[PDB]
Amino acid sequence: WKQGTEAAAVRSGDKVFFAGDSLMQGVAPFVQKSLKQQYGIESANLSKQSTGLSYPSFFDWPKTIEETLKKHPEISVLAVFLGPNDPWDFPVGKRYLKFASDEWAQEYLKRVDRILEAAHTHRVQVVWLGIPYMKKVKLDGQMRYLDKLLSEHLKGKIILIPTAQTLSGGKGRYTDSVNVNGKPVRYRSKDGIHFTAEGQKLLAEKIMEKIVFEPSTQPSST
Numbered sequence: 001w002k003q004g005t006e007a008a009a010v011r012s013g014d015k016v017f018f019a020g021d022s023l024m025q026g027v028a029p030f031v032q033k034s035l036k037q038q039y040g041i042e043s044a045n046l047s048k049q050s051t052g053l054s055y056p057s058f059f060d061w062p063k064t065i066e067e068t069l070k071k072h073p074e075i076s077v078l079a080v081f082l083g084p085n086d087p088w089d090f091p092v093g094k095r096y097l098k099f100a101s102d103e104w105a106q107e108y109l110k111r112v113d114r115i116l117e118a119a120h121t122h123r124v125q126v127v128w129l130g131i132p133y134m135k136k137v138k139l140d141g142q143m144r145y146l147d148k149l150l151s152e153h154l155k156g157k158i159i160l161i162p163t164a165q166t167l168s169g170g171k172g173r174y175t176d177s178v179n180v181n182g183k184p185v186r187y188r189s190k191d192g193i194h195f196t197a198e199g200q201k202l203l204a205e206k207i208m209e210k211i212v213f214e215p216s217t218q219p220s221s222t
Contacts, residue, residue, distance in 0.1 A: 001120040005159055007210045008125035010041055014076040016211070017068060018045040019061060021052055023129070024081035026195050030204030031079070039213045044072060052086035053111045062114040069122050078119050079207060081129040083150075084193055087142035100145055108146075109153050116157065127210055128154055129203070130162035133174040135192025140174060159210050163203060167195075 010016065016035055018028035024047035035041040046068065051059040061082075069075055086108070089098050097104040119126045131147040134140040147164070154160055165171075167187050169178035174192070177184040187199030195203070 001123055003120065003123075003125045003158060005156060007212045008077045008127060008159060009212050009214050010035075010039065010076055011214050012040055012216075013074060014041055015072055015074050016041060016043045016077040016079065017065075017072070017075045017124075018043065018047055018079050018081075019065060020047045020080050020082035020129075021085055022047070022049045022194055023084065023132075024079070025049065026200040027081060027129075027203045027207070028079070030201055031207050034204065034208050035211070038208075041213070044068065044075065047081070050085055052082050052084075053108060054086040054088055054090045056111075062111055062118065065115050066118045069118060069124060073122070075124055077125050077127060077211065078115075079127040079129070080115070083131040083143055083146055084134070084139065087139070087146060099142070105149055108149070112150065112153065126158040127207065128158055128160055129207075130160065130164060132167045132188075132193075133164045135174050135176075135188070139193070161203075161206050161210060163206070166202065166206060167199060 016031070018024055018031070028045040028047055032043040032045055035043055046064060048059055051061060053061055056062065065078065087099055089096060089104070091097070092107050095103070097107055116126060128150070130151060131143045134143050151160060167178070168175045176188050177186045179185070185198050186196050187202065189195055
């Protein structure tokens with residue numbers, strides 16, 4: 001099944017499902033309010049602090065997604081935002097895989113693919129947010145690696161929303177603030193990872209740009 005790669009179509013009665021870590025936790029509530037107030041569309045926000053794809057033993061995102069789509073067949077969009085809790089070695093079966101090795105990357109993307117398969121077999125449209133630049137250079141190097149691994153794999157398969165340049169005003173590296181009409185506005189929280197309310201609202205707007213509500217008279221006949 002081939003979803004749209006530019007935007008996701010929603011109708012009255014659909015739900016939007018938000019998944020990920022604290023990156024998603026701050027953004028999802030703004031999208032949820034916009035969906036409800038603009039279109040009457042309800043949502044399920046399961047984002048959870050400290051979670052990711054590397055340690056399903058802490059919280060199993062692929063299994064949770066499978067179970068949630070089964071419980072809620074009305075979900076038509078799955079939005080995902082995670083990463084910072086994942087740049088760690090992890091075990092698989094009897095192997096112990098080292099971060100950013102070929103085998104580590106293969107397993108990480110197998111878990112990504114399990115999510116995509118769960119969604120696509122049920123005609124659920126996936127929106128995945130790119131990882132922002134981070135203030136700490138070690139985490140930033142890990143996240144630049146992981147963001148590129150993900151984007152190269154996901155481009156052309158799903159809807160991707162990069163965030164790094166948007167959150168930095170195009171500067172190509174981490175900034176705390178971005179000028180909007182010459183006045184600096186802080187987008188990043190004190191931890192140099194997450195967002196202020198202004199940063200959360202901006203990313204929520206970027207998500208809404210990729211959601212297209214369809215009235216009952218769309219699509220049109222020919």
